[PDB]
Design a binder for this molecule. Structure first.
Ligand SMILES: Nc1ncnc2c1ncn2[C@@H]1O[C@H](CSCC[C@H](N)C(=O)O)[C@@H](O)[C@H]1O
Length: 240
């Protein structure tokens, strides 16, 4: 099991090596930040910190951020990336399924970004993870959760490029239960990743079913060469 972890740690290293956060931050809107700002959000819990891009973006915007992740190794990279940008990250190692075990506060908002939720292959785990997020939200809190547009693939199979042509993402295999993407970087590096191909309405169903009163799903065009369909969706789920 130590190889899968090592394989993905190599992947995110390669991603951050070749894709600098300043370009990424210019490309990603200020939409997410504005959404939190216009809701008066102060406390944010990042449950998919990875190497810390979302967290650092929110610290720079002035939010109080708690940075969680299942991986201690990711969190070390996150903390030092934050350190480099001049911020003190507050890291907590936690699994989405018992988020409650190490986190003892409630939040104005939770972010789960970068197509993260897709890493769960069991519906039971999906429900639990969402219920954990929901309990961690204040009564008026909000969950921001994104995903790739898998509907586009399931129903026209080609590569998608990010940060110009720095990395290409190609669907090698996609069925209802699994999407395998080939990632190729500009320096020649190739990584192959499995994730669960969530349909837009299916995620929405899950969110509405664990208790979220209202859900707005935004189309998000992140790829270099844009198509009629968005390559991402952002779910904005209000607890009320
Ligand atoms: N069940 C789980 N509980 C807690 N963290 C999990 C998890 N499953 C996956 N993760 C974490 O979710 C992360 C996905 S990577 C996302 C990085 C960041 N959001 C960005 O956009 O750059 C990984 O770092 C991984 O360790």
């Amino acid at each position: 099991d130590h190889y899968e972890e090592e394989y993905v740690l190599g992947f995110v290293d390669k991603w951050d090596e070749l894709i600098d956060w300043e370009s990424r931050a210019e490309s990603e809107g200020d939409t997410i930040i504005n959404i939190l700002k216009e809701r008066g959000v102060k406390k944010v819990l990042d449950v998919a910190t990875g190497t810390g891009f979302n967290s650092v973006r929110l610290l720079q915007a002035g939010f109080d951020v708690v940075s969680a992740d299942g991986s201690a190794e990711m969190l070390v990279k996150a903390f030092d990336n934050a350190r480099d940008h001049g911020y003190l990250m507050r890291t907590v190692q936690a699994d989405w399924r018992w988020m409650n075990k190490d986190i003892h506060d409630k939040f104005d908002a939770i972010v789960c970004l970068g197509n993260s939720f897709t890493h769960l292959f069991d519906e039971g785990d999906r429900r639990k993870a969402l219920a954990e997020f929901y309990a961690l939200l204040k009564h008026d809190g909000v969950l921001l959760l994104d995903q790739r547009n898998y509907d586009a693939i399931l129903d026209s199979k080609h590569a998608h490029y990010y940060c110009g042509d720095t990395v290409s993402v190609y669907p090698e295999h996609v069925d209802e239960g699994l999407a395998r993407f080939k990632y190729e970087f500009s320096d020649g590096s190739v990584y192959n990743l499995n994730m669960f191909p969530l349909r837009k309405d299916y995620t929405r169903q899950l969110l509405h079913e664990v208790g979220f009163q209202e859900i707005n799903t935004l189309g998000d065009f992140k790829e270099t060469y844009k198509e009629d369909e968005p390559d991402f969706f952002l779910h904005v789920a209000e607890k009320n």
